[PDB]
Design a protein around this ligand. Structure first.
Ligand SMILES: Cc1nc(CCN(C)C(=O)Cc2ccc(Oc3ccc(C#N)c(C)c3)cc2)no1
Length: 188
C-alpha cells in the first residue's frame, strides 16, 4: 500500500472514543514544534487540505519545562478562551526559545499585553473557571493517549502521525506529505 501502518502513521491499540477529529499537541519548549509553527506552518497546511467540515484542535502539554510548562498550558487556555492564538503563538515560541525572555508567568503575560490583550482581560481569563476547564480539557486529551512526546497529531482518536517516516530533504515536500497523510487518515 502507498500509506501503511508504521510508515506515515501508527495505529493506537486503545483508540479514544469521541476525540477531536484532528488533534495536535505541542509545547512552546519543544524545538521541533518551533519548526512546525514558524518554518513549516504544519497546522495551516493541514487545514488547507481538509474539507471545511472538519474541526482542528491544538493543545499545549505540561511535560516540558516544569513549572513554566504548566503556566504555558494555562496561558494557551487563556489564548483559546479569548480567541487570540494567532496573535500570541509566535511571540511565545520566540520568547521561550529564541530570545529566552520568558522566564515566569509575568513574562508570558507581557506577551499578551504586547499583543494587545488588556491587562484586566488577561487576568480575569487567567483566573476563570472557564479557563480552568480548558486546562482540564488539554490534560485529559493528552492523557487519553499517554502522550510522551510532541509535536504529535492524532486523527479521529485512532491514528497518530509518524513524521519520522517521511522524507525531509525538502521542507515543502515533507509538509505536503504530512498534510496529505492527515487527509488520507481523515477519509479512512
Ligand atoms: C513516534 C513519535 N514520537 C513523536 C514525538 C517525539 N519528539 C520529541 C519528536 O521530536 C518527533 C519528531 C517530529 C517531527 C520530525 O520531523 C521533522 C522535524 C523538523 C523539521 C524541520 N524543520 C522537518 C522538516 C521534519 C521528526 C521527529 N512523534 O511520533
Amino acid at each position: 500500500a502507498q500509506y501503511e501502518d508504521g510508515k506515515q502513521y501508527t495505529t493506537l491499540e486503545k483508540p479514544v472514543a469521541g476525540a477531536p477529529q484532528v488533534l495536535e499537541f505541542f509545547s512552546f519548549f519543544c524545538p521541533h514544534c518551533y519548526q512546525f509553527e514558524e518554518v513549516l506552518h504544519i497546522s495551516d497546511n493541514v487545514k488547507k487540505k481538509l474539507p471545511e467540515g472538519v474541526k482542528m484542535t491544538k493543545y499545549h502539554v505540561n511535560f516540558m519545562g516544569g513549572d513554566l510548562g504548566k503556566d504555558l498550558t494555562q496561558a494557551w487556555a487563556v489564548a483559546m478562551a479569548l480567541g487570540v492564538e494567532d496573535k500570541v503563538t509566535v511571540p511565545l515560541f520566540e520568547g521561550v526559545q529564541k530570545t529566552q525572555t520568558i522566564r515566569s508567568a509575568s513574562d508570558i503575560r507581557d506577551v499578551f499585553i504586547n499583543a494587545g490583550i488588556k491587562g484586566e482581560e488577561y487576568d480575569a481569563a487567567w483566573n476563570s473557571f472557564v479557563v480552568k476547564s480548558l486546562v482540564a480539557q488539554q490534560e485529559k486529551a493528552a492523557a487519553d493517549v499517554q502522550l510522551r512526546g510532541v509535536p504529535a497529531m492524532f486523527v479521529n482518536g485512532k491514528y497518530q502521525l509518524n513524521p519520522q517516516g517521511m522524507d525531509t530533504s525538502n521542507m515543502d515536500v515533507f509538509v505536503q506529505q504530512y498534510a496529505d497523510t492527515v487527509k488520507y487518515l481523515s477519509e479512512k
